[PDB]
């Protein structure tokens, strides 16, 4: 579909047998989800945003279903106020900005 | 135009006689620009992002030219690593997400 920006662009994601809502964020190079129970190995990593840097855990080869669209990629888990779908993923689902 | 997300969506903005580059951010409710010399009165305000809260100054009725498209609205000035064009503005220029 087509999302206008009068309200936040929130969408249903299915990650590791769990259902969540995430914001489609063109302003994010990466996808960062709040602490969820995800299986596999992960490494320590740090991402910056507007007030600072938070340490997250990177999980590679993670399968996600964004609004029914499947994609595989890097997913960062940490203390984010919201589940963010970033550029690494948006490209997989052929998402563009039009104006 | 149409922006694919292989690279960050950066665009030329013209604000108060100055030329800048800004990121089109669907993940932002507001537009926050780095400290620039803007005339008028402003109030203290705070915005949160992924590492915390930063205090900014709100300027209302600010004219901006986003990729040649004029719009008027609220603009927040503060210590952001990047000039962000948020939802308040994206709607004015008829910007949508498609996939």
């Amino acid at each position: 579909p087509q999302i206008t920006l009068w309200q936040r662009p929130l969408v249903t994601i299915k990650i590791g047998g769990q259902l969540k809502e995430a914001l489609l964020d063109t302003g994010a190079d990466d996808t960062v989800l709040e602490e969820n129970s995800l299986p596999g190995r992960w490494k320590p990593k740090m991402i910056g945003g507007i007030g600072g840097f938070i340490k997250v855990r990177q999980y590679d080869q993670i399968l996600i279903e964004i609004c029914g669209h499947k994609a595989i990629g890097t997913v960062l888990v940490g203390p984010t106020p919201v589940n963010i779908i970033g550029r690494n993923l948006l490209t997989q689902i052929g998402c563009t900005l039009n104006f | 135009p149409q922006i694919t997300l292989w690279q960050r969506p950066l665009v030329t903005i013209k604000i108060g006689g100055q030329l800048k580059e800004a990121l089109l951010d669907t993940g932002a409710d507001d537009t926050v620009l780095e400290e620039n010399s803007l005339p008028g009165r402003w109030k203290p305000k705070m915005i949160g992002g992924i590492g915390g809260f930063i205090k900014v100054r709100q300027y209302d009725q600010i004219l901006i030219e986003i990729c040649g498209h004029k719009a008027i609205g609220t603009v927040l000035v503060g210590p952001t690593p990047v000039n962000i064009i948020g939802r308040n503005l994206l709607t004015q220029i008829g910007c949508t997400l498609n996939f």
Partner: peptide, 5 residues
Amino acid sequence: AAXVX
């Protein structure tokens, strides 16, 4: 890196 407000 990555959401304002």
